[PDB]
Amino acid sequence: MENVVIIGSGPAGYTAAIYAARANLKPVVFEGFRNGRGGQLMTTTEVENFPGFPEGITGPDLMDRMRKQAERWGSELYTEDVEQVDLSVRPFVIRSSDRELRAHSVIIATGATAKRLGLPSENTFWSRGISACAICDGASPLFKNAEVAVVGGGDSATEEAVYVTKYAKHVHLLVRGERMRASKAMQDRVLANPRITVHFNTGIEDAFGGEVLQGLRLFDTRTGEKRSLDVQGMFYGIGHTPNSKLVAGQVELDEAGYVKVAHGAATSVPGVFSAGDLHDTEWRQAITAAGSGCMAALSAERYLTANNLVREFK
Amino acid sequence: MENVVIIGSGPAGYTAAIYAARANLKPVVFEGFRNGRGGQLMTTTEVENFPGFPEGITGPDLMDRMRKQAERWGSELYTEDVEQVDLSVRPFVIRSSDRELRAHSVIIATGATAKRLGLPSENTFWSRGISACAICDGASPLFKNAEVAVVGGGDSATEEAVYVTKYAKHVHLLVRGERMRASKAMQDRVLANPRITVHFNTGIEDAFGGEVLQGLRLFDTRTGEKRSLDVQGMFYGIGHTPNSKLVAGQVELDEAGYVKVAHGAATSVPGVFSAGDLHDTEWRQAITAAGSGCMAALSAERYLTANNLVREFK
Ligand SMILES: Cc1cc2nc3c(=O)[nH]c(=O)nc-3n(C[C@H](O)[C@H](O)[C@H](O)COP(=O)(O)OP(=O)(O)OC[C@H]3O[C@@H](n4cnc5c(N)ncnc54)[C@H](O)[C@@H]3O)c2cc1C
Ligand SMILES: Cc1cc2nc3c(=O)[nH]c(=O)nc-3n(C[C@H](O)[C@H](O)[C@H](O)COP(=O)(O)OP(=O)(O)OC[C@H]3O[C@@H](n4cnc5c(N)ncnc54)[C@H](O)[C@@H]3O)c2cc1C
């Protein structure tokens, strides 16, 4: 019988764990394995906007520090994916590949789905023409005077397209719909730039090449008409998807799948708290996710206390 | 003409500065001087719950790192108190002891008022019987089998009183009103404990002693009747006061003086954003203040952009 079970090992999950462990709750953390232990910062290079690191810190080193801190203060860390939760009963039921636990309270910190398309040949060209971060990778020798694609039509994606025109001979911006979702300034900047072609009503079937990317198999999203595009790079500027499937149908979600929260972390289910990118439609930073993890942990501790649910030993 | 002026050098102010500087806004930060540069963490010993520091970090070292990071990315840092702001005109007017600036946007991150009473003899016995942090200081040799006072009747204060009964022969809990504001469990724990006396309707006039604290001059808050209390220690477990006087009468405040915010950081005045303890009635942690500073900076950047207020050079 757990006081609290935390799901996720991003900055939200680990900050929640540090607060819950320091309150003597002996949190259990399902960190993920197939979901990617350590969250989105494991996939970046250098973090420069996490306060307390004036020299910068690698994503992996920052997340390693957070894990060590969680462990130091008494967190039980499982490198296991949660397969199923039951929030309709009390105590709550949490099932991983390896074990089933009951818990007086649950912190869900499952973040965003992986920034990738899942194309058949995606793993083939990963780091060999395909990149999920144009800012991290755009200046690489591979892309110097290349034709490249940027996937998406949002604010991030138009800025990423313009950035990459510093290095690439030509940028093909690939938009699913008829209209970019970026600001009109960003649109005038893109539609002006002589080194950007915007493809509207464009989806991606697969990537092709040899030892590295040589192009994309595309289709019109209205008619399915197919064509090929020769590019030596592809950057993902795709939108944020909250990873809420564990709780879909059990807590209130908005239209995009974000968990709805009150008072910083409270879900529609008493005793269930959300932290991080899972409910964040605005900021999507490691520092805001960490603050959110703290709010969920303090929220869980006050819920456990008010209901007299904490025991001396588990 | 500033893009943004930040007031305060706590985790909120410096995190805002890092985000604004990295967005190329060349923020100016009025860090404070008489107000205490570096915020509340300058007054603590070891910080253990700021994610990314598994070994712990001193308050001063963590705040030194944040200052260096703010400076690295292009913040203009002034060790100056803001004396007056005018938020009724645009551009906004900000006046320090040394200069007067105009700004398209303002981030107020003025935090909490100093944790002290201002008693005439307070500076005399500071670190010599008077402490603002029972958790930091309770285990000190000075307090071993001493009679000590804890000021306040809140949740923090009752927990602090119980903590200090591990070390002190007797704890006098000094409450201004007739009732503790702590939970009924905390009250039963306190009123049970044979080593705690609760003084209701009790205020503090001054401290007395020689090279160290020997007691308090007290008064009944209903009649003003005076008495003396012999103690060799006094711990401040007093409540949180938001330092909102700069903006009092110019932005909407709640009854306790907290700035009212919408969408994470927006005040009642468009272009004016709040971050940190100044608007936080719930969490009051360095990590939640830092996340808040990020939200205010991103909010200011989007306001400046939407209104086309940013220039190439200032
Ligand atoms: C390329 C890139 C660069 C970035 N750079 C920066 C930057 O420099 N600075 C910055 O502030 N932000 C940056 N971000 C954003 C930042 O990484 C996120 O805002 C932050 O990591 C979100 O934290 P989180 O804890 O909410 O979620 P996530 O980081 O998404 O973590 C969610 C965690 O939950 C786990 N999980 C999911 N489902 C399950 C399950 N069923 N069982 C168990 N565990 C599960 C996942 O494996 C993961 O560990 C970047 C993002 C990316 C993709
Ligand atoms: C003893 C103690 C121990 C603590 N320990 C911890 C802990 O271990 N972990 C934790 O997470 N939290 C801790 N906290 C809480 C934490 O310090 C605060 O939550 C946090 O510092 C608030 O950040 P902030 O930036 O909102 O405000 P503050 O830290 O209060 O900073 C406000 C800043 O604004 C400045 N300012 C005020 N008025 C003006 C003006 N007119 N002009 C210019 N500048 C001005 C002040 O000088 C100060 O620099 C502790 C607090 C105390 C008092």
Describe it.
Chain A has 314 residues and is of the alpha/beta class. Chain A has a domain at 122-236: FAD/NAD(P)-binding domain. Chain A is built from 7 helices and 18 strands. In chain A, helix 1 runs parallel beside helix 7 (286-306). Chain A is elongated. The relative contact order of chain A is 0.19. The A-B interface holds A 11, 14-15, 18-19, 22, 48-54, 57, 62, 65-66, 68-69, 72-73, 183, 185, 263-264, 282-283, 285, 287-295, 298, 305 and B 11, 14-15, 18-19, 22, 48-54, 57, 62, 65-66, 68-69, 72-73, 183, 185, 263-264, 282-283, 285, 287-295, 298, 305. Chains A, B: Disulfide bonds join 133-136. Chains A, B: Homodimer. Chains A, B: Belongs to the class-II pyridine nucleotide-disulfide oxidoreductase family.
Sum up the structure in keywords.
homodimer; 314 residues; alpha/beta; FAD/NAD(P)-binding domain; five-stranded parallel beta sheet; 7 helices; elongated; binds flavin-adenine dinucleotide; flavoprotein (chains A, B); redox-active center (chains A, B); FAD (chains A, B)
